[PDB]
Amino acid sequence: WDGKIDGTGTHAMIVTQGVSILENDLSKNEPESVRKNLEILKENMHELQLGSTYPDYDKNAYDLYQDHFWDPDIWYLAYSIPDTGESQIRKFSALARYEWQRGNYKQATFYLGEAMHYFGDIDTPYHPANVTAVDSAGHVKFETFAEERKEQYKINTAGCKTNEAFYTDILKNKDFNAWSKEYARGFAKTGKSIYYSHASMSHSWDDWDYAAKVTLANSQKGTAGYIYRFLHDVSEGNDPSVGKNVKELVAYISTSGEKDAGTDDYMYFGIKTKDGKTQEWEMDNPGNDFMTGSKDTYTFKLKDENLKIDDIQNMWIRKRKYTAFPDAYKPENIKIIANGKVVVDKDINEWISGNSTYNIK
Ligand SMILES: [Ca+2]
Ligand SMILES: [Ca+2]
Ligand SMILES: [Ca+2]
Ligand SMILES: [Ca+2]
Ligand SMILES: [Ca+2]
Ligand SMILES: [Zn+2]
Predict the structure, then answer these.
(1) How far apart are CA 46 and CA 51, in angstroms?
(2) Annotation-wise, does 2 bind a ligand?
(3) Which of left, alpha, beta for 244 (phi over 0: left; psi -120 to 50: alpha)?
(4) Ligand 5 center to residue 247 CA distance, Å?
(5) Are 250 and 309 in contact (CB under 8 A)?
(6) What whole-number distance in Å separates Cα of residue 112 and Cα of residue 226?
(7) Among 176, 194, 199, 232, which residue has the least CB neighbours within 10 Å?
(8) Cα of 284 to ligand 3 centre, how many Å?
(9) From the CA of 140, which ligand is nearest?
(10) What domains can you pick out in the chain, each with its CATH number?
(11) Radius of gyration of the chain (CA)
C-alpha cells in the first residue's frame, strides 16, 4: 500500500481503522488491563501511523524492497537468510512487546506500526503474488487507485465482538510466531487470489474497485486482530518463547550515526553452547549492510534444531578486514530475538577495529 513519511496515506488509514475497529468490537468482559493498554496505544497514535509508513522511506531499505514481499504458497548454516514480509511481522512484533514491557511506549508503538506496515503489504494483491512494480505497471497503478479512494474503503468492525470467534481464535495459540504465520497466510492467500481474479492489469476498473474493497477491508480487520493479540500479550506478559527449541535467532543491530561508524568489512555473528559447540554465520543482506546510522536485521538458522535458549552460552560479532586496512565499525546496540522474545539487549557504543571480536553474551 501507499504511505507517506509523515504517517499519512493508505497504510496510516489501515492502522488507524484497526484501532477504531477494535474499540468498536471490544466486548464488556475484556480485562481492565487490555482497556488500559488500549488507551496507552491511543496516546501514541502518531507513532503507530508513522511506523505504519516508515519502512517505505527507511534509508536502509533493501534494493527492491524484497522483504516487503512474501509468497504464502511457499547455504543457511553459514549465512544469514533474507527476511520476508511474514518474518518482519514477527520481528517488529517482538521488538514492540519488549519495549512495551519496560514502559517505552512511544518506541513500542512505532515498532507495532512497522509490523503492521508489513502485514498491510502481504494483504495487498500484488505483494503476496510477488508481482513487483518492475514486473508490472499495475503494481503502482493499483496502489495509487486505492490511495485515492481509501476513504470509501474504511470499515469500523470486524463483524463480531471480541468475545466471539474471529477474536477468540486469535488468542488460542500461545505460540505467537506459529499463530502469526498462519494468520498472515490466510490473508495473503486471499490477496494473491484477488491479484489473479481482479487486481492484475488484465482486469477492469470495476474489478480493481472490488479488489481494493476486499483487500483494504481485510487489511483493516487483520490489523485489528494483530492489535488485539498485542494488547492481550502485553497486558499479561505473555511469553511465546516458552520454551521451546531455538531453530532460528534474529539479530537487530543498530549502527552508530557517528562518522565512519558503518563498515564494509566481513561481519560474522556466532554462538557457542554450554556443550562447547559453535556456529558462525556471515551477516550479509541483499542490501547495503552496516551503513552508518542504520538498523539491520539478520536471521540465523541453527544446525542443531534441538537447542534451548539457555544452552546458548556465548554470542559475539566478529569483523574481518576486506582490504589491507581496518574499516572500524561502531554498533550502538544489538538485540537478539528468539521465538518471539528479545532475549539479549546489549548496548555497545564502542569501536570494533580491524579483526576484533566483540563479546555480546
Ligand atoms: Ca568504518
Ligand atoms: Ca569514510
Ligand atoms: Ca559478504
Ligand atoms: Ca549485502
Ligand atoms: Ca556500505
Ligand atoms: Zn505498502
Answers:
(1) 8
(2) no
(3) left
(4) 29
(5) no
(6) 9
(7) 232
(8) 6
(9) 6
(10) 1-241 (1.10.575.10), 242-361 (2.60.60.20)
(11) 21
Q: Is 284 annotated as a binding residue?
A: yes
Strands (DSSP E) along the chain, which ranges?
Answer: 248-255, 266-273, 278-282, 295-301, 312-320, 331-338, 341-347, 357-359
| Range list of H helices, 201-279 | 205-236
CB 359 within 8 A of CB 316: yes
Element (H, E) at 184: helix 176-194
Which residue type sits at 274? K
All three cell numbers of 186: 490466510
- Smallest CA-to-CA distance from 186 within 90, 91, 52, 73 is with 73
Cα(325)–Cα(64) distance, integer angstroms: 31
Residue 68 labelled as part of a binding site? yes
Q: How far apart are the C-alpha atoms of 50 and 48, rounded to whole Å?
A: 6
CA of 287 to the centre of ligand 3 (A): 11
Burial call 223-258: b when 16+ CB within 10 Å, e when fewer: bbbbbbbbbbbbbeebbbbeebebebbbbbbbbbee
Neighbours of 270 (CB within 10 A): 16
**CA 119, 123, 126 angle in degrees (round to 5)?**
120
Ligand nearest to the CA of 320: 3
- Which structural technique was applied? X-ray
- What does the alpha-carbon distance between residue 179 and residue 172 come to, in Å, rounded to a whole number? 9
Q: What share of the chain is helix, strand, coil (3-state, %, to 5)?
A: 45, 15, 40
Distance CA 62, CA 314 (A): 30
Task: Measure the CA–CA gap between 44 and 290, rounded to whole angstroms.
Answer: 30
Whole-number Cα distances in Å, 157 to 82, 256, 316: 35, 43, 47
In three-state secondary structure terms, 221 is helix
C-alpha cell at 167: 477474536
Name the nearest CA neighbour of 71 among 55, 60, 58, 87: 87
Calpha distance 165→258 (Å, rounded): 51
